[PDB]
Amino acid sequence: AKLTIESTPFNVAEGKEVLLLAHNLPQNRIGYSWYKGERVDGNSLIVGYVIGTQQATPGPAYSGRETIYPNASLLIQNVTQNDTGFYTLQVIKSDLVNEEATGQFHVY
Amino acid sequence: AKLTIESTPFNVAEGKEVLLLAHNLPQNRIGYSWYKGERVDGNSLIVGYVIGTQQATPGPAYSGRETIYPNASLLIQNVTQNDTGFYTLQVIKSDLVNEEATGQFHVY
Numbered sequence A, B: 001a002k003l004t005i006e007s008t009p010f011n012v013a014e015g016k017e018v019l020l021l022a023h024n025l026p027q028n029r030i031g032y033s034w035y036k037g038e039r040v041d042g043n044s045l046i047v048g049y050v051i052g053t054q055q056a057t058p059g060p061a062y063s064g065r066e067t068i069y070p071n072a073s074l075l076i077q078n079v080t081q082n083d084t085g086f087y088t089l090q091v092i093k094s095d096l097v098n099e100e101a102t103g104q105f106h107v108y
C-alpha cells in the first residue's frame, strides 16, 4: 500500500507542536530518514533512525526541536512561522527498494 | 568531501557503455539505490543494493542493461537515446543520515 504522511494538527500556533504521522509503513522496514522540504536531500536531512538499535542520529537540518519515534512519527516542537511548508519521510527497507512520502503543515 | 557523481565517458555513443562513478563515498555505507532522473523517487528506482549480502533488487526503471557494484558504480551497457540525462545515487549509511548526488551523461 502507498506510504503517506499526515500532519496532526495541520494548522499549528507558533510555539506549539506538530506530529507528522506515517500511514502504510512497509513490512520490511529497517529505518527512517526525515527531511525538510519536498525532496530527499542529504543537506536537508533532519534525523535518521535505525529501528533495530533504536538509534537516532541528527542530520544537517536538525534544529534541536525534532524527535523521531519507532513508528516513524516526527514531533516538531517550538514551531515558528518559518517552518510552514513541506516535509519528507523515507522509509529504508531491507532490500533498499525504499519508499518516500511528503506532507505539510502550516504555522500561524 | 561531499558525495559526487561522474559519468565516464560524459558523451556516450549509442550502443556503447557508460560508467557512473561516485567520489567521496561515506565510510559507514551499507548500500546503494540508483535512480533515473534528478531525485530519489521510488517510481524511478533502477536498482537497490545491499553491500553486505551483495543482493541487488531491481526497481521500475530497471531495463536489463544496468549493473551495480560494491564500489557504488553503475554500468549501463547498450546505451540508447532513452538513457540520456540525469541519474541519482543515494548512499544508505548505517546511521541512516543518507547522502545523495546527481550526475548526467549525453548520448550521441
Ligand SMILES: [Zn+2]
Pocket (backbone or CB within 6 Å): A001, A002, A003, A024, A025, A026
Ligand atoms: Zn506499502
Ligand SMILES: [Zn+2]
Pocket (backbone or CB within 6 Å): A041, A042, A043
Ligand atoms: Zn542537495
Ligand SMILES: [Zn+2]
Pocket (backbone or CB within 6 Å): A013, A014, A108
Ligand atoms: Zn501567531
Ligand SMILES: [Zn+2]
Pocket (backbone or CB within 6 Å): A106, A107, A108
Ligand atoms: Zn499562513
Ligand SMILES: [Zn+2]
Pocket (backbone or CB within 6 Å): A108
Ligand atoms: Zn501573522
Ligand SMILES: [Zn+2]
Pocket (backbone or CB within 6 Å): B006, B023
Ligand atoms: Zn572524477
Ligand SMILES: [Zn+2]
Pocket (backbone or CB within 6 Å): B001, B002, B003, B024, B025, B026
Ligand atoms: Zn563524506
